Structure 1
Amino acid sequence: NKCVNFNFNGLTGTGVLTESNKKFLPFQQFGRDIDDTTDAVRDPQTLE
Protein backbone atom coordinates (compact mmCIF):
# COMPACT_ATOMS: atom_id res chain seq x y z
CA ASN A 1 0.00 0.00 0.00
CA LYS A 2 2.92 2.37 -0.90
CA CYS A 3 4.29 3.36 -4.31
CA VAL A 4 7.55 1.35 -4.46
CA ASN A 5 9.91 0.15 -7.12
CA PHE A 6 10.53 -3.56 -6.75
CA ASN A 7 12.61 -6.51 -7.82
CA PHE A 8 11.15 -9.98 -7.08
CA ASN A 9 13.45 -12.93 -8.06
CA GLY A 10 14.95 -10.64 -10.82
CA LEU A 11 11.49 -9.54 -12.12
CA THR A 12 11.70 -5.73 -11.87
CA GLY A 13 8.64 -3.47 -11.67
CA THR A 14 6.88 -0.54 -9.98
CA GLY A 15 3.52 0.10 -8.30
CA VAL A 16 1.34 -0.27 -5.24
CA LEU A 17 1.66 -3.84 -3.92
CA THR A 18 -1.31 -5.37 -2.00
CA GLU A 19 -2.77 -8.62 -0.59
CA SER A 20 -4.53 -10.81 -3.22
CA ASN A 21 -7.56 -13.11 -3.21
CA LYS A 22 -6.19 -14.91 -6.40
CA LYS A 23 -4.65 -18.46 -6.22
CA PHE A 24 -1.76 -19.44 -8.51
CA LEU A 25 -0.87 -23.14 -8.88
CA PRO A 26 2.32 -24.23 -6.95
CA PHE A 27 4.57 -23.74 -10.04
CA GLN A 28 3.45 -20.25 -11.25
CA GLN A 29 5.28 -17.17 -9.81
CA PHE A 30 4.17 -14.10 -11.82
CA GLY A 31 0.71 -13.27 -13.23
CA ARG A 32 0.20 -11.71 -16.65
CA ASP A 33 -3.13 -10.36 -18.03
CA ILE A 34 -4.52 -10.38 -21.64
CA ASP A 35 -2.20 -7.39 -22.36
CA ASP A 36 0.83 -9.57 -21.37
CA THR A 37 1.56 -7.12 -18.48
CA THR A 38 2.65 -8.24 -15.01
CA ASP A 39 -0.31 -7.75 -12.62
CA ALA A 40 0.58 -10.05 -9.66
CA VAL A 41 3.56 -11.90 -8.05
CA ARG A 42 3.95 -14.67 -5.43
CA ASP A 43 6.22 -13.44 -2.62
CA PRO A 44 9.27 -15.82 -2.44
CA GLN A 45 9.26 -15.92 1.44
CA THR A 46 5.58 -15.87 2.59
CA LEU A 47 4.51 -17.71 -0.64
CA GLU A 48 1.34 -15.62 -1.01
Structure 2
Amino acid sequence: KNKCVNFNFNGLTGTGVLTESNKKFLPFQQFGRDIADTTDAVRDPQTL
Protein backbone atom coordinates (compact mmCIF):
# COMPACT_ATOMS: atom_id res chain seq x y z
CA LYS A 1 0.00 0.00 0.00
CA ASN A 2 0.94 3.66 -0.49
CA LYS A 3 3.24 2.72 -3.40
CA CYS A 4 2.88 2.99 -7.17
CA VAL A 5 2.53 -0.61 -8.40
CA ASN A 6 1.11 -2.45 -11.39
CA PHE A 7 -2.17 -4.28 -10.72
CA ASN A 8 -3.59 -7.30 -12.54
CA PHE A 9 -6.90 -8.57 -11.12
CA ASN A 10 -9.29 -10.51 -13.39
CA GLY A 11 -7.82 -8.82 -16.46
CA LEU A 12 -8.21 -5.29 -15.05
CA THR A 13 -4.62 -4.28 -15.77
CA GLY A 14 -3.17 -0.90 -14.92
CA THR A 15 -0.82 1.07 -12.70
CA GLY A 16 -1.76 2.88 -9.52
CA VAL A 17 -1.20 3.42 -5.81
CA LEU A 18 -3.05 0.94 -3.60
CA THR A 19 -5.21 2.48 -0.87
CA GLU A 20 -8.02 1.46 1.49
CA SER A 21 -11.38 3.11 0.75
CA ASN A 22 -14.94 2.58 1.98
CA LYS A 23 -15.96 0.66 -1.16
CA LYS A 24 -17.97 -2.41 -0.10
CA PHE A 25 -17.61 -4.89 -2.96
CA LEU A 26 -20.34 -7.52 -2.87
CA PRO A 27 -19.46 -11.16 -3.66
CA PHE A 28 -20.63 -10.61 -7.26
CA GLN A 29 -19.00 -7.22 -7.91
CA GLN A 30 -15.77 -7.41 -9.94
CA PHE A 31 -14.29 -3.90 -10.07
CA GLY A 32 -15.24 -0.27 -9.47
CA ARG A 33 -15.42 2.55 -12.02
CA ASP A 34 -14.71 6.24 -11.48
CA ILE A 35 -16.55 9.26 -12.91
CA ALA A 36 -14.72 8.76 -16.22
CA ASP A 37 -15.94 5.12 -16.48
CA THR A 38 -12.39 3.83 -15.90
CA THR A 39 -11.24 1.21 -13.42
CA ASP A 40 -10.33 2.82 -10.08
CA ALA A 41 -10.92 -0.09 -7.68
CA VAL A 42 -10.48 -3.87 -7.90
CA ARG A 43 -10.72 -6.90 -5.61
CA ASP A 44 -8.37 -9.81 -4.95
CA PRO A 45 -10.09 -12.81 -6.63
CA GLN A 46 -8.24 -15.37 -4.48
CA THR A 47 -9.48 -14.07 -1.11
CA LEU A 48 -12.08 -11.36 -0.52
TM-score by length of 1: 0.75
CA RMSD, aligned part only? 1.4
- After TM superposition, where is structure 1 displaced by more than 6 Å over at least 4 residues in a row? none
**Structure 2, unaligned runs of 5 or more:** none
Identity of aligned residues (%): 98
Higher strand share: 1
TM (norm. structure 2) is 0.75
How many residues get paired?
47
